[model samples]
Target: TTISPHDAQELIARGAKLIDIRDADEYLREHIPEADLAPLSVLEQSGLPAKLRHEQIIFHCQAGKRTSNNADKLAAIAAPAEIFLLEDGIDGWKKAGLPVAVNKS
Candidate 1:
């Protein structure tokens, strides 16, 4: 399912895991609070987190390209998780007036 920024926020409120597929640099620049860094480039190598494979996982990126790619890979991997791609990603999140946190370090 495609999740909207508002819906992503609601999912987070209801205890869903948000996975950002952008590079570490981009993620450190700014990202949704509490989001786990799972860059698409290394998603497979990094291995899916044990706890996340069974939770409501929302994937996003700077735009949507990377996240969509990762979603396809994840589906092929068949990790038994419920994965949703953010429609427009962080760009959309900002457009929607949703809150975001920038890395302080």
Candidate 2:
């Protein structure tokens, strides 16, 4: 399933975990403040280091294409937990006027 940035914000407020599936470099430039970095590359190489503890998990990438394309893999990794894709990924989040952490260095 997918959710808008506003809906995602509410879920986060209610304690859902947001996972950023983009690479380290992309994330370092800018990312959602509340999201945890869990790049797809790392997951592909070693799989989830450990089981995620959140009851609700939301996965996102730069444009949503990545997460939407890899939904199967992500779902397998996040089994038993409710999962959602952040519509249009971080781009949409920003377009929606959601807060993101920007690196100036």
Candidate 3:
């Protein structure tokens, strides 16, 4: 299923784990607060941690496509977790006026 920035914020408030499937550079450039980086290119090598597998997981990328694909892969491994994608990605999140955190450190 797809989520809006508003809904994503609510999910996070309720303890959901947002997963960013974009590459490292993109993630460092800008991302949602508390979002975990799990690039699709290294998904197999970077196994899904147990804590994250138990939480509601929201996936996102530059666009929704890659996130959706990653969600499918995540589902194949763990069916219990609720996986969702951001409807419009970072662009939509910004359009919706949600706040984003830039990695400046």
Candidate 4:
């Protein structure tokens, strides 16, 4: 379902893992903390991690368009307690004042 950043934050507090569906290079440029890169192609690797399979999982890409385009393919991996799609993707997340992870070090 489409979820706001605030809602995503709440899910995170409860144990949801934020997954960035973009490629490794894009993820390294910036992403949510713990949003560890699990490329959309990773969707083809197998299924969600054993640790995340039964948990609340939020998936997002550079923009909602990408995720929406592949939504079905994503759910195929692991149907979780809940699946939240960022309303505006990473761009939306930043506008909400949430911190982003950038590997400059």
Off by over 4 Å in 2: none
Model 4 C-alpha lDDT per residue in residues 30-65, reported as the tens digit of each score: 888868567877677876777655467888898688
Number of the top-ranking candidate, with TM-score as the measure: 2
RMSD of each: 2.0, 1.3, 2.1, 1.6
Q: Which stretches of candidate 1 lie over 4 Å from their true place?
A: 103-105
lDDT of 3 at 97: 87
Model 3 stretches with alpha carbons more than 4 Å out: 69-71, 103-105
Top lDDT prediction, candidate number: 2
**Which pairs of residues collide in model 2?**
none
Worst 10 residues of 4 by lDDT: 46-55
Q: How close is candidate 2 to the true structure, as a TM-score?
A: 0.93
Which pairs clash inside model 4? Answer: none
Query: lDDT values of the candidates?
Result: 0.79, 0.90, 0.78, 0.81
Candidate 3 global TM-score:
0.83
* lDDT tens digits by residue: candidate 2, 1-105: 999999999999999989999988999999999999998978777776555448899999998999989999999877778999999999999999988999999
lDDT of 3 by residue, 1-105 (tens): 799989988988898888787888998889877688878666667667676665588878886776676666856544577877888788778889888888887
Q: Give the candidates in order of lDDT, highest first.
A: 2, 4, 1, 3
lDDT at 24, model 4: 87
The list of candidate 4 runs beyond 4 A from truth reads none
Give the winner by lDDT: 1 or 2: 2
Q: Clash totals for all models, in order? A: 0, 0, 0, 0
